[PDB]
DNA sequence: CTCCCC
C-alpha cells in the first residue's frame, strides 16, 4: 500500500548507548538501515552534550521500524547503564 | 569511542 512522504525525525540517545546501535564496524546500524529501509544518521554529541542525535529519514512506516529496531538494540547494549 | 554513515 501507500507509504506516503519521506519525512525526517530526530531522536536523541544517551551517548553511552550509541555503541549498541552502531555495533562493531557499524554492523548493527548497517542492519537497522537495511532492515528498516530508513536512512539513519547518528551525529557526534554537540559541544559538551550527554546525547547524540539520530536523524531518521524515511516513510512513516520506515521511521517507525527503525525506531523500534534502535530501541531493541539497547537490549544488546554491552556497557554500563550507570 | 561496539563509531557506522558522510
Swiss-Prot record:
Sites of the Glycyl lysine isopeptide (Lys-Gly) (interchain with G-Cter in SUMO2) crosslink: 24, 41
Annotated phenotype, changing residue 43 to A: Loss of sumoylation
Residues bearing the modification Phosphoserine: 39
Cross-linked sites for Glycyl lysine isopeptide (Lys-Gly) (interchain with G-Cter in SUMO): 41
Induction description: By DNA damage, including ionizing radiations and phleomycin treatment or UV irradiation. This induction requires ATM kinase activity (ionizing radiations and phleomycin) or ATR activity (UV irradiation). Up-regulation is due to protein stabilization. Constitutive protein levels are controlled by MDM2-mediated ubiquitination and degradation via the proteasome pathway.
Disease linkage: Au-Kline syndrome: A disorder characterized by intellectual disability, facial dysmorphism, cardiac defects, and connective tissue and skeletal abnormalities. Dysmorphic features include long palpebral fissures, ptosis, a broad prominent nasal bridge, hypoplastic alae nasi, an open downturned mouth, ears with underdeveloped and thick helices, high palate, and a unique tongue with a prominent median crease. Hypotonia, hyporeflexia, and high pain tolerance are additional features.
Protein's UniProt name: Heterogeneous nuclear ribonucleoprotein K
Organism: Homo sapiens (Human)
Organism lineage string: Eukaryota, Metazoa, Chordata, Craniata, Vertebrata
Gene field: HNRNPK
Residues of the full protein shown: 385 to 463 of 463
